[PDB]
Write a protein that binds this ligand. Structure first.
Ligand code: NA
Length: 418
């Protein structure tokens, strides 16, 4: 006899695909099926409710694979299956091949319960396929979620950057929808974000529908809660009619660093994941969760220690920190004079700065202004690898791991000229 192959592309490891023999027959060179009977994949009891196999086949002849009558037949068959005509195949990553199939029409699905509570997976849309030695794409996909933060020094969104205490930290979660979104009757959609422990959320969260190079706000259609992380949910995304398989859902919000934010290489991280409907068949209500997407924000502490040439600690200095925008230095932080001899500028980032001694301790020369540059090196993985602090007129000591930048300001007395 003759046997045929179905090769499924876009498959993932960890699945068990089932092929049910719906129709037997003979396949010609034009992929036309003759001499049609019911295959063993359809339970004998349920066959009579479809009628004669040949005439059922004839009624579908020439219709689109994604036409309504064929989708209907697939879903009805799914409740009429028999193990008698079943072939189970463990999936491979990329491409899964099933050879030695009896000729005819097959129903393809994921084995029941095989993906329950498995992250980043979904049950395939039930497929009807003629076994004809060809490759087809599995009608299965998962949504993706990416959490990003706006780069400190540009407009683009990346996984990690550095920020200062005076900055607003913009975050952006981008969700893509599965290619088979249309097959779902309803679509559960819930984004959970851990938020960042060393930051305060500004509560300015908005949700956008992004497609065709444009954005529309859809925030009011979502439930936005803070009982279990920051959660942004809609019971059924299908109630938004302009959302489709090619739509992107984008969540934006901003935060700001606390004065207790983690310094140095550990960073201040948050993770986000999506909970989604993972089975488009039989109006199912099971969900799965995407893997976490992480974003990180680094920051440093600049410490000044005010001393004199006698190596004594000196109180009563005051410092004004400027950061360079263009050619224009702009005041970002001031520490007024006190009994303190230490000055902590907690939450500083890469950039060009100027430090001014706005108040000089009694009986000492005013320090000359110090211009300095902080650099941050963040590798492709988003890890902070290096940090430096340098000036043409001063020396800093740095600890990249702890995120410390230390400057000793040496106060010197004037001249007694008798
Ligand atoms: Na799959």
């Amino acid at each position: 006899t003759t046997t045929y192959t179905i090769q499924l592309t876009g498959t993932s490891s960890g699945h068990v695909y089932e092929l049910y023999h719906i129709f037997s027959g003979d396949l010609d060179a034009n992929n036309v099926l003759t001499n049609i009977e019911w295959g063993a994949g359809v339970a004998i009891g349920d066959r009579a409710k479809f009628g004669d196999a040949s005439e059922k086949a004839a009624s579908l002849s020439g219709k689109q694979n994604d036409s309504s009558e064929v989708k209907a037949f697939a879903q009805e068959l799914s409740n009429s299956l028999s193990a008698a005509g079943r072939t189970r195949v463990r999936s491979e990553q990329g491409t899964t091949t099933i050879s030695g199939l009896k000729p005819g029409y097959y129903l393809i699905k994921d084995s029941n319960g095989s993906l329950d509570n498995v992250k980043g997976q979904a049950y395939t849309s039930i497929m009807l396929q003629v076994a004809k030695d060809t490759t087809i794409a599995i009608k299965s996909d998962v949504p993706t979620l990416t959490k990003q933060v706006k780069a400190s020094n540009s407009e683009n969104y990346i996984s990690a950057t550095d920020y200062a205490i005076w900055d607003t930290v913009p975050f952006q979660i981008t969700v893509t929808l599965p290619s088979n979104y249309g097959d779902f009757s309803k679509y559960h959609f819930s984004v959970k974000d851990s938020m960042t422990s060393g930051m305060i959320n500004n509560g300015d969260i908005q949700v956008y529908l992004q497609q065709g190079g444009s954005e529309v706000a859809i925030t009011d259609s979502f439930s936005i809660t803070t009982n279990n992380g920051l959660t942004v949910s809609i019971a059924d995304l299908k109630t938004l009619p302009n959302v489709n398989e090619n739509s992107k859902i984008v969540i934006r919000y901003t935060a700001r660093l606390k004065d207790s934010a983690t310094l140095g290489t550990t960073g201040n991280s948050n993770t986000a994941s999506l909970t989604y409907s993972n089975n488009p068949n039989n109006n199912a209500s099971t969900t799965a969760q995407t893997l976490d997407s992480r974003a990180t924000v680094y920051t440093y502490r600049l410490r000044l220690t005010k001393v004199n040439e006698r190596q004594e600690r000196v109180a009563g200095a005051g410092f004004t920190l400027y950061k360079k925008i263009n050619n224009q230095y702009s005041e970002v932080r001031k520490i007024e004079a006190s009994s303190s001899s230490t000055f902590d500028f907690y939450g500083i980032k890469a950039g060009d700065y100027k430090l001014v001694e706005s108040t000089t301790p009694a009986g000492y020369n005013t320090m000359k202004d110090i211009e300095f540059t902080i650099t941050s090196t963040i590798d492709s993985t988003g890890a902070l690898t290096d940090m430096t602090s340098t000036s043409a007129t001063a020396t800093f000591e740095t600890d990249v791991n702890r995120g410390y930048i230390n400057l000793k300001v040496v106060n010197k007395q004037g001249a007694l000229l008798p």
